[PDB]
């Protein structure tokens, strides 16, 4: 099982266990803040927005 090995790391960073195959295929391819929750939810529920999606 070939695992991702990278050079020139600071020697204090251990690369996570990621398979080389996956890495290769991965690389190749006013209180307005509070009201933002309600605005987002109402926009999402609107039939026009669902129709557009």
């Amino acid at each position: 099982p070939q695992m991702v090995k990278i050079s020139k790391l600071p020697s204090d960073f251990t690369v996570p266990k990621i398979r080389e195959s996956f890495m290769k295929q991965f690389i190749d391819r006013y209180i307005d803040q509070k009201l933002r929750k309600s605005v987002f939810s109402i926009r999402a529920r609107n039939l026009l927005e669902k129709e557009t999606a």
Binding site: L9, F13, P16, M23, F26, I27
Partner: peptide, 10 residues
């Protein structure tokens, strides 16, 4: 660490 590794790869 995963994001750092994906950047370090390429």
């Amino acid at each position: 660490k995963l994001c750092v590794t994906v950047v370090a790869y390429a």
